[PDB]
Amino acid sequence: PTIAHGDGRRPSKQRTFIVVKNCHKHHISTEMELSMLDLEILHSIPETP
Amino acid sequence: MKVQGSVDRRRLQRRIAGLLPPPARRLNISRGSEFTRDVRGLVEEHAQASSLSAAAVWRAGLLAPGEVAVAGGGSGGGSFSWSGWRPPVFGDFLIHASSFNNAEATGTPLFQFKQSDPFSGVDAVFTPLSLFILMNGGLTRMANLLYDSPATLADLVPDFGRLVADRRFHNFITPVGPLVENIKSTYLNKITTVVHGPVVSKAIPRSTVKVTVPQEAFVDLDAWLSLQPCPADARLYVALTYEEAGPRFTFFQSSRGHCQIMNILRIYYSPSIMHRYAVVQPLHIEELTFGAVACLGTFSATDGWRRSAFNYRGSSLPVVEIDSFYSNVSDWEVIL
Amino acid sequence: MASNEGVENRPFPYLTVDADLLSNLRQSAAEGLFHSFDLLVGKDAREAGI
Amino acid sequence: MDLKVVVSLSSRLYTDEIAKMQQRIGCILPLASTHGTQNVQGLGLGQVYSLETVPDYVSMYNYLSDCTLAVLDEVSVDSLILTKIVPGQTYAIKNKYQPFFQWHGTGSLSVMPPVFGREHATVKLESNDVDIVFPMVLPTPIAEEVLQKILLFNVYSRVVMQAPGNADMLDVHMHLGSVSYLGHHYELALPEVPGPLGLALLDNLSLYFCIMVTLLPRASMRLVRGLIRHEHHDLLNLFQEMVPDEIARIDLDDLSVADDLSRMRVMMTYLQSLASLFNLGPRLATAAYSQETLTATCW
Amino acid sequence: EYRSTVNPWASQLGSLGDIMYNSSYRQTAVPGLYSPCRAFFNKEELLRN
């Protein structure tokens, strides 16, 4: 908005601002190692206690 | 209607249906589930052994066309492109039982001297300690316990006087790879190593194999040298060096690269080249050569080569051990 | 490296306790606060054979 | 099994550089770490090749052979997605490097630093305050040709320090300055000061030369002597009627086969190891290339 | 206001201190070490603001 003034001051007419905001992306990762022996005996059927 | 061409639809779809599915990766995760039938299948790796039954062999999947066993028989079969797991290529050697000491670390890298008698049936194979005694605290006390009467090793190599003089000893020695299996027999032993493959134990209850080198000889080339990258792989090398004192054997580790390593080894051997070239031997025709280098395999950087002792005969020897080795031998490159 | 001649890796049935043992642990073993310790990482963090 | 890196940018990039980066999709550039997620600072060749420091061209080679190459796959506002190059896999790679050399089917490619220019390689990311410098790849026959051009300059520029000679600095710039190709001449950017690590590579080369010079076979020397006079050949046209005086002075004794034989045996072992000095970088094998598609299948 | 500088040998463009610590001429320098005077003598670092 604006104010009305008596002097010769140059009147600023209607004004609007258009503003834009944008998205940011974040990534995350971790690593874990496992033994082939465990990954394998996961598959086998155990024969003895 | 006319029989659709020569090709038959609904018959190629079945045949291609088997070829289509690739192996599993990138499964979605839920903390609620946190262990599923889906997560299991992605992890299980299908060991290749059996209990010796016609029905039990079908269970494990040994009778499968691909080079590696695919479990479940036909089920889950036809992927054929999964982590490119390549089986190891084993080698079998017949050895004089008095030449090889049975108390060896099961993982020690081996070297075969190429004999010069045609149509033989036995071979000459040396450990790093056998090579020490042959080439003539530390290895001196320990190698002499393992190998007494060094004559029996000198009998295998009858030209050793001549070969190390003309500086052609290295090209008759071919690296073979770490020990995997050893049968202990009275007269002619039977040794099994692994050449060009993931060094893996063939025993029934699996145990991790780690190649072992005496700490006296093993020299970390990367720390002695000390933005630079941190790559995945690191390599093991051997250097046979003809010096004034005599031939010598050393092991090296670094992840720089071949063209760089051949430069670092010349800087590393600069004190010892000057000495031999001034004290004893200035110059001759054949005697020009200094040494050679070969590559013994690739192992994972950031780890491996812990230190440990080798206990035998009430005395120890400090030894390094490398994990997840992958044997890969190249020929000798002359350094000078 | 450096088991320090005191530890057996046999798979025991361990007992869960509520206490907080993590606090400032890494820099305690690194400087010898306690002898005969072991440090297992990744593939090595598994039960041993029987 | 899974070979993918997600390089995350801290700050959004501008609409002009997302458009410039997309022209490079299918190009190789070496990243520092073999991890699933990374920063942009390890991405390019930019740290070794900066504007504030002189380009060595041999420390840059050593950076490539240590790093892990990757193929750019996808470009967005906040990411760059790549697939790393590991030994036992096959890849599909495009020919999109700016000084344009055309590839053959079933040839071998070579990876070398941006020899032809700093500006040809970089896509400047002024939004993220980084310059992403791509390496230049060539066919193997021409890549070795450029590597030799660069090394001899490190010697001859130093040998000719400040010579008013019209012959000097005009012959060594017309001979070594350019690399010709099919209907083209490509200028090389050569360093004003030959720095270290480039001379230290030529020191190793000399050591091989000091050895080989003592064991040269003489039968070889007497052959060239007879041919430069009696016969006419295109290979020997380099030598004019005049014969190198050194050879007549080196070769005086009569030929003996048993000596030239063992001279050849010792010498051949040095060339076999000499070859390791020249590769100096990663090599690719290409099995299929489409002139129009601009896509190889490298291995 | 009354003086131009305190030391021309560092203020002026081609001067000694500028030569030593400004990036335009330190091509030969080893990139590892840290220079405190870089923030004050570097041109891009001054004009970034």
Residue of D288, D278, D286 whose CA lies nearest to D138: D286
Q: What angle do CA B83, B87, B93 make, to 5 degrees?
A: 160
Question: In a 10 Å sphere around its CB, with 0-12 CB exposed, 13-18 middle and 19+ buried, how is residue D109 labelled?
Answer: buried
**A40 vs C: CB within 8 A:** no
DSSP H helical ranges for chain B? 12-19, 37-43, 54-60, 128-135, 139-146, 151-156, 160-166, 221-225, 258-268, 270-279
Neighbours of chain E (3+ CB pairs under 8 A): D
Separation of alpha carbons B15 and B216, rounded Å: 59
**B206 vs A: CB within 8 A:** yes
Token pair recorded at residue D234: 């295109």
Separation of alpha carbons B260 and B243, rounded Å: 23
Separation of alpha carbons B225 and B227, rounded Å: 15
Separation of alpha carbons B292 and B239, rounded Å: 6
**A39 vs C: CB within 8 A:** no
User: Which residues does chain B have within 8 Å of residue A36's beta carbon, measured at their own beta carbons?
Assistant: 45
Start-to-end C-alpha separation, chain B: 80
DSSP state of B123: B
Residues 6+ apart with CB under 8 A from D211: B288, B336, D270
- Contact predicate D225/D251, CB 8 Å: yes
Contact A29 D37 (CB under 8 A): yes
Neighbours of chain C (3+ CB pairs under 8 A): A, B
**How far from A16 is each of A1, A11, A12, A13, D104, CA to CA, in Å?**
9, 15, 12, 10, 61
Separation of alpha carbons B107 and B140, rounded Å: 21
**B271 vs D: CB within 8 A:** no
> Considering CB atoms only, which of B25, B231, B288 is closest to D1?
B25
**B302 vs C: CB within 8 A:** no
In the PDB record, what is the listed experimental method? cryo-EM
Residue of D135, D142, D109, D101 whose CA lies nearest to D121: D135
**D192 vs E: CB within 8 A:** no
Separation of alpha carbons D164 and B27, rounded Å: 71
Burial B108-127 (b: 16+ CB within 10 A, else e): bbbbbbeeeeeeeeebbbbb
Q: What angle do CA B221, B226, B227 make, to 5 degrees?
A: 110
User: Min CA distance, A20 vs chain B (Å)?
Assistant: 34
User: Which residues does chain A have within 8 Å of residue C43's beta carbon, measured at their own beta carbons?
Assistant: 33-35
φ/ψ of C42, rounded to 5, equals 65, -125
User: Min CA distance, A25 vs chain D (Å)?
Assistant: 7
Separation of alpha carbons B239 and B250, rounded Å: 5
